[PDB]
């Protein structure tokens, strides 16, 4: 009101800096997977006990200290060096199995070219097998067994899942998304090709056409027919499944992947391009931002699924059986399927969405390329060649099983374990050690002297004794909670499970081991180790 | 069952032109295409063009483009074909056949007793 | 557009024997898994009825007498247990695009 101009110029610098493909796509199946309503409030209240104060200290760090995600531990705790290669593996598998989507976001802007828009044929185009072209415009029974066009589209052409049998079985590679991922990694490699990008005129006019794209469909959802079905499930309180059913886990790996802390991505752009610029308020208005965007998206998604509910004549929660990660790409399907100007439309989303998707990749691997670099600044900091190639090809290699026919097996698969705990536990890990192996009150004082203010006390008391129970608490609640994981018509078998127990360790392990290679190189007994390890370093 | 009903034999004229009908009932009609193939006398099968239901696509072979269109029908569940510049030697039987329910893509053994104009 | 022609022309009528009919489609290639290929019988006087689609499973009210094989480029018809009311005329039809098109016959006759 009375700041409204710097209050819209914080606003509009953080969407340009913030949001991201994770808060539009992994939240809205996570939250229906846990369904609407009795997710938000925990949502929220897993944000501002153990999302903020986390941004804030990460934040903090990065402005004080000056270094990589890796580099910090070199003047706090050098035994707790394994989380820089704890973050380099989480990072790695996330590229591994982040850009399947936008190899088919890619994949659907392409094929979005024509005239007719392939949402809406099912007429013996690709594959498709009881299909449904009109839900109730022409006086249809929707009887089971039927799928949606969309849904038979994504599942016969953009990926031939009908050519796995499940996990077990992985076919050949597909070609279409091969050549589209080389693109990918190629446009992507060209951006990071040095790695200045502080006020870029690319992105001050791409972080734009986002908000009104998103303002009009989100108006064109809520003038559907049929839609409010879907706002009723969106807002219910149901109590009776929050008890000890195991959701604030999903609300806490959905918060700790959208919000950035647990990742790395937050101190290799604290460590530059910001100085003592108005903090402690930068990361709120940011987390606002995020939270609110994460909130249009959901209530956009709920409303199509609402919508498509009162079409089929079914319940809100059962139209996506079991959908993972393929709730975005149908029910955004079936929105634009439904509009004017369809291939405008669909272009523009097809648009923005890639180039948000390229925006929070360019965000992630920045958490791991100048992160190494502190530690060997003579044989991998000048070269800035030789190296990016290589992770690039690093990253394009382990990219490739989740290319297979059945992608969506392996994708499901790497969503819930590859950043499930391990992200948890290294914020933890990292948390309880500035906690009381660095000093709060040495914290304090530094950001006091950097900054000349303060903080409440809200946040002295959190990550001392808040932060660190709230956090050991989920991860006894992950590790006592064994996952469930269904595709369509497909059941993961005992395995599975331990793939997944394996895959979350090998991220997390890389601490212990460093925490006993430790022990090892200083000599004399176990106490004056420990002091040794416990106390910084000095330059 | 099935049953696809056709029109009966009619006369050929140099410059004139013809409508064969082809009446589907049995399954869901807007579903599936409508082939249209042409069988000379003594020779073998040719294809024309097939049609959707619901004014989706019209194809054809490349060479009956300009001499043949298809009309499709939603309310009585008919399909038409008029043809155009009918010649001499454009004297076969058409018949009609039906596409599949997607995927596969075969005739489902729905076939017409032929039109042979003549 | 894809041409697709047959090596056989005429094969002879004998009981209980094998009689091979293959329609080469070097000008295409498997779209999503399943073979876009079908194979029709034409009786003298009798419309081309169905008899094998996608040339690895069997149509509606077709006796197991014939079953296709062959995946990708060529495919071949077995019709080891062929009897005299056999005698018709197999066509091909490949349905990659639009490419629908037929072949040049193969009847049989001793």
């Known amino acids: 009101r009375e700041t409204w101009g710097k209050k819209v110029d914080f606003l509009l610098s953080v969407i340009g800096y913030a949001v991201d493909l994770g808060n539009v796509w992994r939240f809205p199946y996570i939250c229906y997977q846990n369904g609407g309503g009795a997710f938000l409030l925990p949502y929220t209240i897993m944000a501002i006990f153990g999302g903020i104060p986390l941004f804030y200290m990460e934040l903090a760090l990065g402005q004080y200290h000056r270094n990589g995600c890796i580099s910090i531990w070199r003047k706090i705790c050098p035994i707790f060096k394994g989380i820089g290669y704890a973050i380099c593996i989480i990072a790695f598998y996330i590229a591994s199995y982040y850009n399947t989507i936008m190899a088919w976001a890619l994949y659907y802007l392409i094929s979005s070219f024509t005239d007719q828009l392939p949402w809406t044929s099912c007429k013996n185009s690709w594959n498709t097998g009881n299909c449904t072209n009109y839900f109730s415009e022409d006086n249809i029974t929707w009887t089971l067994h039927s799928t949606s066009p969309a849904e038979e589209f994504y599942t016969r052409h953009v990926l031939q899942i009908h050519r796995s049998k499940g996990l077990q079985d992985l076919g050949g590679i597909s070609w279409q998304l091969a050549l589209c991922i080389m693109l990918i990694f190629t446009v992507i490699y060209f951006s990071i090709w040095k790695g200045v990008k502080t006020s870029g005129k690319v992105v001050w006019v791409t972080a734009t056409f986002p908000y009104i794209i998103l303002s009009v469909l989100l108006v064109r959802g809520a003038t559907l027919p049929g839609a409010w079905r879907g706002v009723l499930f969106y807002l219910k309180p149901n109590w009776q499944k929050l008890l000890e059913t195991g959701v604030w886990i999903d609300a806490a790996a959905q918060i700790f992947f959208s919000l950035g802390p647990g990742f790395g991505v937050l101190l290799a752009f604290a460590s530059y391009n910001k100085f003592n610029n108005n903090c402690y308020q930068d990361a709120l208005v940011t987390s606002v931002v995020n939270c609110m965007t994460s909130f249009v998206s959901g209530f956009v998604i709920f409303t199509v699924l609402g919508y498509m509910a009162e079409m089929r004549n079914e319940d809100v929660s059962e139209v996506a059986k079991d959908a993972g990660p393929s709730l975005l790409f149908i029910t955004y399907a079936e929105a634009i399927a439904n509009m004017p100007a369809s291939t405008f439309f669909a272009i523009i989303f097809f648009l923005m969405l890639i180039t948000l998707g390229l925006d929070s990749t360019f965000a992630g691997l920045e958490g791991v390329i100048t992160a190494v670099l502190d530690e060997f600044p003579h044989v991998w900091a000048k070269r800035r060649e030789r190296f990016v190639l290589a992770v690039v090809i690093t990253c394009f290699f382990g990219s490739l099983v989740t290319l297979t026919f059945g992608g969506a097996y392996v994708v499901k698969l790497l969503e819930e374990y590859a950043t499930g705990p391990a992200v948890l536990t290294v914020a933890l890990i990292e948390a309880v050690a500035v906690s009381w192996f660095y000093g709060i009150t040495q914290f304090c004082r530094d950001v006091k002297e950097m900054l000349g203010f303060s903080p409440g006390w809200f946040w002295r008391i959190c990550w001392v004794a808040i932060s660190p129970l709230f956090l050991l608490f989920i991860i006894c609640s992950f590790l006592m909670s064994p996952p469930q994981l269904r595709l369509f018509q497909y059941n993961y078998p005992y395995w599975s499970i331990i793939l997944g127990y394996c895959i979350g360790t090998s991220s997390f392990i890389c601490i212990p081991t460093y925490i006993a290679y430790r022990l090892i190189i200083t000599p004399g007994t176990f106490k004056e180790r420990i002091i040794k390890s416990i106390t910084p370093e000095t330059p | 069952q099935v049953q696809l009903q056709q029109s009966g034999p009619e006369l050929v004229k140099l410059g004139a032109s013809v409508r064969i009908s082809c009446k589907a009932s049995?399954?869901?009609?807007?579903?599936?295409?409508m082939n249209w193939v042409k069988q000379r006398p003594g020779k073998g099968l040719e294809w024309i063009g097939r049609?959707?239901?619901?004014?989706?696509?019209?194809k054809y072979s490349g060479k009956f483009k300009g001499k043949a269109t298809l009309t499709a029908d939603k309310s009585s569940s008919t399909v038409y074909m008029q043809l155009s510049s009918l010649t001499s030697e454009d004297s076969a039987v058409y018949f009609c056949?039906?596409?599949?329910?997607?995927?596969?893509?075969?005739?489902?053994?729905?076939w017409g007793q032929g039109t042979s104009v003549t | 557009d894809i041409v697709l022609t047959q090596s056989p022309a005429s094969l002879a009528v004998s009981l209980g024997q094998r009689a091979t009919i293959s329609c080469r489609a070097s000008?295409?290639?498997?779209?999503?898994?399943?073979?876009?290929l079908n194979w029709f019988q034409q009786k003298p006087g009798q419309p081309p009825k169905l008899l094998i689609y996608?040339?690895?499973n069997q149509g509606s009210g077709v006796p197991a007498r014939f079953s296709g094989s062959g995946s990708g480029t060529y495919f071949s018809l077995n019709i080891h247990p062929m009897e005299e009311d056999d005698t018709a005329v197999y066509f091909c039809?490949?349905?990659?695009?639009?490419?629908?098109?037929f072949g040049g016959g193969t009847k049989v006759e001793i």
């Open positions: 039809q490949q349905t990659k695009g639009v490419s629908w098109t």
């Open positions: 996608a040339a690895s």
């Open positions: 049609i959707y239901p619901g004014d989706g696509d019209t």
């Open positions: 049995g399954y869901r009609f807007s579903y599936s295409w």
């Open positions: 056949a039906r596409s599949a329910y997607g995927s596969e893509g075969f005739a489902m053994d729905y």
């Open positions: 000008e295409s290639v498997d779209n999503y898994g399943i073979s876009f």
